[PDB]
Each structure stands twice: as structure tokens, then as C-alpha cells.
Design a protein around this ligand. Structure first.
Ligand SMILES: Cc1ccc(C(=O)c2cc(O)c(O)c([N+](=O)[O-])c2)cc1
Ligand SMILES: Cc1ccc(C(=O)c2cc(O)c(O)c([N+](=O)[O-])c2)cc1
Lengths: 116, 116, 116, 116
């Protein structure tokens, strides 16, 4: 699993379950091309987005539909979504965990980048 | 000042000075149109991006160039930028403060929304 | 004002108003002695806790009563309080802004330290 | 594992390894009694702090020695440590994950509280 996304809920203190997200890769003409997508599991994690051979260097965007998550809980949110945009670097061996911590009017995101 | 952005550096414990950002508004054809731009001051704040007359209802995107900020400090950060996307003014004019807290592999954003 | 504390509500997207906090200083016998206290204003800020003469070198603790804040809003939070413990002024007088961002099951704190 | 602590490094984008922490429980006379301790593993996690039979309702404090972590990396930190103080509640079945995200001048902590 070269890329995993984990989402947490800071209001209920729980994994954020059934959060939908799309992953895009920047194309030559500076447009965003769909790459992968899915929804978080009961653990708040989304695995199996890509494979090592497909996950080449490039600029990737993870668009997390936070608004739909809060709407389903009956809570008015600020953001339309959370976008995480990053360059994937193959100068070393690197697995990526993107974690997002969600509140209605705030979110934080961090990258845990580890070498196998 | 209906829209202000404040940027902080969590490594140095300081305002994030001279951070560029661009603000976009979603047009009727679902494209992002340029709306305003500027750089943070010595206090880490960017004021005067817009006016009450110009800041109509809509979906706005603030793209904060965090990558250039860290690179100039000698750090290779994870993110290309910090994006904040939100619907503004859809129940009337509000005042928005967007705050971003920056680390090389993490950022957080929050909104303070007040009614004049 | 060498010490200011700002508290924000990440659920409502607002300053956290009327939040009590106590400041302690570590005494020579390693006990915590009361140093100052107060409540945040309508802007979520607490100014005037101390003076430059009184704010000597030492280890300080700010204990922010986040639990009472959430309880009065009908929420049972995780934390009893948000504590910030730091050495102050040990290379000369600095100005400290402690900012706390609150959610029911999460908080973040950051410091902005400036040299007068 | 009724209680697990995970620590992440927002400067290097990695688990925070070999971070020492002590867990305390509030005693009848309002003093902090040692309860458990350990250091994070290569994954940034500390498991096996307590057992279900020993982890009774009460006020617990997790004191994470963040200062020693940053000092070992040659980075000047703001906080003496990060204290997470919370009430453990047995009104339902509850496993606790305390996660801390560390920067030199900022930290965030959240609780993921799940039912087995
Ligand atoms: C921005 C942010 C801050 C804190 C968290 C966070 O609390 C968290 C919790 C987990 O159970 C967990 O497995 C991870 N992880 O692997 O990165 C992070 C998640 C995101
Ligand atoms: C995401 C996040 C978390 C904490 C901060 C933060 O530390 C901060 C500090 C200030 O002096 C201040 O005036 C504000 N503000 O008005 O929103 C925020 C900034 C951003």
C-alpha cells in the first residue's frame, strides 16, 4: 500500500467513517486527472488506492468530501472539502499515510512518510 | 475588511511573513476565476483582499503558497500549498478570518466567522 | 503585554468567549505557585495577565478550563483542560501569544514568540 | 489494549520514535499518582500501558516528554512537555487512542474513542 488515507472526527472522537474522497494527478497541461477514489472504512482508513507500479512521481491531489460527512451528521460545516496537494518523490523508498483531523470549522492534515 | 488571512509558523513560533496567496471565486461555468491576491505582512496577516461590495455570495478558494515559504527557509515541505475552499455570505454578509498553522509535513486551517 | 492567550472554537468557527484559565509558575521547591488568571473576552483573547517586571524567567503553566466551556454548550468533552507548559524569558524578555484551538475531542496549541 | 498513545512528527513527517511518556491517575487528595509509562516504538505507538481490569474510571494524565524528543533532534522547542488530561468513562465499552502531533512550537492532541 504505497498510499493510505486516514480521517478522524474531532467532534465525536472517532474514526470518520464512509468519508468519500477522490485522488487526482496533475496532467501535462496543468489539469487534474482522476487517479483513484474510495470511502473510508469503519476504522476511518482508505487502503488500496494505488499500486507501487502505478504511483509514479508527480503532483497528487486528495479531495476529501468533508462537507457531505458533516451534512450527514446534521452539523453545518465551513469547508466545501479538504484538499491535500503534494508531490510524490521517488528519490527514496516511501510509503505515504495522509491523515486528516476534521472539525466543522477547522481541519488539519499531516503526512507520515516512511521507508519500507 | 470582510476577508483576512493569518498564517503562522509552528517550527519557529512566529508569524509566517511574506507568504503569497491567491483567492479564486467559482464562476457560473464552474471554473475558478481570480478574485484577489497578496502577501502576509510582518504580523503574518493579509488584510484588504476585498470589499463588502465585491465579496458577494459564492464559493471561494484561498491557495496559500506554503511550498515557497518553506523552500526559502531551506526546508522541502510535503504540501504544494494549503487550500481553503468555502461558501461565503450565503445567509448575508459575514466577516471571515482564515488562519493557517504551518509545519513542513502538516498544516491546519480554521475559520472565525463573525456577523457585523 | 508580555503574555496573551487566545482561544478559538473549531465547532462554531468563533472565538471561545468567557473561557477561564489559570497561570502557574514553578517555584524553587518544584511546586506550582499561582501567577495570574482571567477569562477570555468577546474576541477570545485574555490580555493583561502580567507585566514585564513580574514576568521573570521561569517555567510557566497555563491551564485553560476547556471542560467548563464545552459543558456550558451542552457537549461532554474528552479533555479536562488544555495545559501549556513552557520556559519563558530565559534568554531575556520575550512577548508570548499562546493560542488554543478547541474541539470536543481534540485541541491544538501554538506559541508565537516575539522579541520587543 | 484499553489505552494506546501514538505520537507523530510534523517536521519530518514520520512517527515520533522513542518518545518517553508517563501516565498518572488523580488520587483522592488531588495528587498525581504514577500509573504506567513507556516509550513509543518505531511506529510511533505505545501499547500495553494498562489492562481492562486496571483501567478504572478516573482522571488520567499522559505527560509526553516532547522536549527531550526535540532536543535529541537538535531543534529548540517551546513546550516542556505535552500533557493530556482526561476522564476515563465506563458508561459504555471504550478503547482509547490518544494521538499527539508534534511541532517545535505547537502540538495537537486528539482522542479516538471506540466501542469494541
Ligand atoms: C492532522 C492529524 C492529526 C492527528 C491525527 C490522529 O489523531 C491520528 C490517529 C490515528 O489513530 C492514526 O493512526 C494516525 N496516523 O496513522 O497518522 C493519526 C490525524 C490527523
Ligand atoms: C489552524 C490554526 C490554529 C491555531 C492558530 C493560531 O495560533 C492563531 C494565533 C493568533 O494570534 C490568531 O489571531 C489566530 N486567529 O485570529 O485565528 C490564530 C492558527 C491557525
Amino acid at each position: 500500500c504505497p498510499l493510505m488515507v486516514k480521517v478522524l472526527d474531532a467532534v465525536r472522537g472517532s474514526p470518520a467513517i464512509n468519508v468519500a474522497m477522490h485522488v487526482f494527478r496533475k496532467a501535462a497541461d496543468d489539469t487534474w486527472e482522476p487517479f483513484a477514489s474510495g470511502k473510508t472504512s469503519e476504522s476511518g482508513e482508505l487502503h488500496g488506492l494505488t499500486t507501487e507500479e502505478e504511483f509514479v512521481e508527480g503532483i497528487y491531489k486528495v479531495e476529501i468530501d468533508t462537507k457531505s460527512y458533516w451534512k450527514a451528521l446534521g452539523i453545518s460545516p465551513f469547508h466545501e472539502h479538504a484538499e491535500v496537494v503534494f508531490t510524490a518523490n521517488d528519490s527514496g523508498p516511501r510509503r505515504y499515510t495522509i491523515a486528516a483531523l476534521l472539525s466543522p470549522y477547522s481541519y488539519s492534515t499531516t503526512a507520515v512518510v516512511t521507508n519500507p
